[PDB]
Curated annotation (Swiss-Prot):
GO terms under cellular component: membrane
Cell compartment(s), UniProt: Membrane
UniProt entry keywords in alphabetical sequence: Membrane, Transmembrane, Transmembrane helix
Keyword Protein biosynthesis applies: no
Name of the featured protein: Uncharacterized protein MG075 homolog
Keyword DNA damage in annotation: no
Bilayer topology term: Single-pass membrane protein
Principal subcellular localization: membrane
Whole sequence portion shown: 60 to 868 of 1030
Source species of the chain: Mycoplasma pneumoniae (strain ATCC 29342 / M129 / Subtype 1) (Mycoplasmoides pneumoniae)
Recorded superkingdom: Bacteria
Amino acid sequence: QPAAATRITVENGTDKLVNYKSSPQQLFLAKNALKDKLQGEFDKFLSDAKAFPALTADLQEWVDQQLFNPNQSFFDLSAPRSNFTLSSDKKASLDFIFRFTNFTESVQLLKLPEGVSVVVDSKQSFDYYVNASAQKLLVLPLSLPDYTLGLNYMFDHITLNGKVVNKFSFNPFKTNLNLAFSNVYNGVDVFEAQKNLVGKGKYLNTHVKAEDVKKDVNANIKNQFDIAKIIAELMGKALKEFGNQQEGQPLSFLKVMDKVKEDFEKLFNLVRPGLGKFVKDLIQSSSQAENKITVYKLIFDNKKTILNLLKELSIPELNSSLGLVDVLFDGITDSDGLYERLQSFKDLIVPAVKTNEKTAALSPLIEELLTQKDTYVFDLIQKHKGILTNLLKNFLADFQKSTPFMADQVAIFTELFDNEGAFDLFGEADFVDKIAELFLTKRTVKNGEKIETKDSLLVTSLKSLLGEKVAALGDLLDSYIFKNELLNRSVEVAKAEAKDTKGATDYKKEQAKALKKLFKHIGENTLSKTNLDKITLKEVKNTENVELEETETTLKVKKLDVEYKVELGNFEIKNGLIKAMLEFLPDTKDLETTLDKLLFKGESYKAMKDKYIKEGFPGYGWAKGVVPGAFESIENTFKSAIDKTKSIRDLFGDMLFGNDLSSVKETDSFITLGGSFDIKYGGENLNVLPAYYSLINSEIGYQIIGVDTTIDATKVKVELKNKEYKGKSPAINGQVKLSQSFFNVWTNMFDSITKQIFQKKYEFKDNIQVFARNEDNTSRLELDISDPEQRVIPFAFVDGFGIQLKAVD
């Protein structure tokens, strides 16, 4: 028969951690370090009430799987005797008896997972001598779907058959104790990891080659440059569609992705191979897409990339499902049944899917989209909000974390997404006009007195950017650059002072006209494809093989010398780009009031006027009435030598273009970048160690720590092609000419900016984390990740800094 199981239940629970030292509240230790504290946890869960039922289940599993599955067709079983000594003593001494007898009339042999080899005849009562010595239970790690620390037992002694089976195991790699962890796992931490993974001819040493290192670094530089070119082209392949349209027809950010689907595909398969088609299909899985598709063929038109992007996490499911991920790839199971079988196997796929809540957070969304069908995508798949824009922000943030020095784009996108709104611009809307409602509108929606205290976003951005660099035009920036409707729309005020829909009434458009013209210009002249063609990167040295240095448990880089003369060609910061953002300034003919307010009836010249009225003019002394004869004809000359037919637009036109506004053509030259600047990655005596992902991964990389990134921006010629003056009717022509004076001062200040704000041989030190991927997405560097000795755990906090699994002790 069989032994009686009075404690066959296996229900149990997990454990927790306690803060120590100055580690953050997020405790994520690994194995090692506490090799004797898991001893304590196992003893604690070993010498209590719920321990002996679990040991009953352990012995049940052993006597079931390890005794009579290779038996029991021709050997019966009987184990009348059973006792436990699992008290608080925590020791080990077991006392069972199991009797084996055969009912068959034949000579057979007992199959046991042990040194068992003996002839057995029919009707024989095999004796299985069960006894134990005194010992303490070691600890085995589990191969759970969680790969937790194995709060479990490695046995050391059982006196069986009259002998000892050294380092015995009762059913290894499985236990009925369910003592999983959510914080601390098993393996080699990062440095005990960087102890059996780096050596003389060991793993990382033998799987990284000098030619591969050089190819990886040079391809990283080329990818950086080229991705910059794609990003610029988009900013000019999207701006052209933003601004080329006439008002009255919307064009949002999701609609504009229709014109740059292949552009995103190129960008995303250049940042990471195999992902370009994914993002193009993703954009096609939107409301504004030309074709409407579901998320099933989207999620399965690559498989590996999506599973390894979403499920990354630390583990415990990626490499675990890698026993079924390859099985999941099998049969590609065949067409017209592949969909059905994948929907069927989602039932066991879903745990890895639901183990989310890191940066990639749309895994719950995809699991709801995959459990049941989805049809309309025209809001039903838009309420997920883990949508094109959010995922774009996520992956671009990842790119920034890998490429720190393009911080401007990710930053500006962050305050773009800093609001809970603007989600409709990720769908059917009009992009530039709505963002003007967001960037260039003082929201005052009411009619009592005034709700103008909602300063627009672009005003705040420029007041933070150009805050107090110059003190003269700050009041100008407030008065006519910001208190304007051009940089502060003041909605509902247009329909509060007129309320008849006149041409100049609708102030959302008059700002929009100039902003859209600037977008059109950037989309056809400056950042067009034709003009962005002539921004070329070329090799300089790129020939010396970067051989590795090895010294025991270390791996070093001898020397690096790579230079990249980024030829700027003649990038045409064209006359006309500035013309639009000059249209940002008012064109009203009331110039005289503006100059009277800024220069005379202001905050500082008024003080000097009062001072000179009171006293002054040294040398004269007694002449007090002359002062109201001095600041009465100087102002007369200044305000009589201004042509009223010109507007402040034309004043800044003289200041910037040189000649006046309407006589200056867009097909001129205004700024034409010359020469070429150089990037100088290099480093000598640099360490190299196994590079892990932002969190754990099965796929080891290799990062070269200590690269000295020298950016020499010199050897450029930023010419201001209108460097002289040829004017005929200056706005302030006369004996007080500012237009020529302003042109001189602007040329001087712009030369100062281009000489100082630009090249200074900026130096920067960082680390290159390159995960060299093979042709068919089969990255060369890898571990066995099978034995409980190479499961590296980067999320560990090393015990060298000090870790104790006790509450502040």
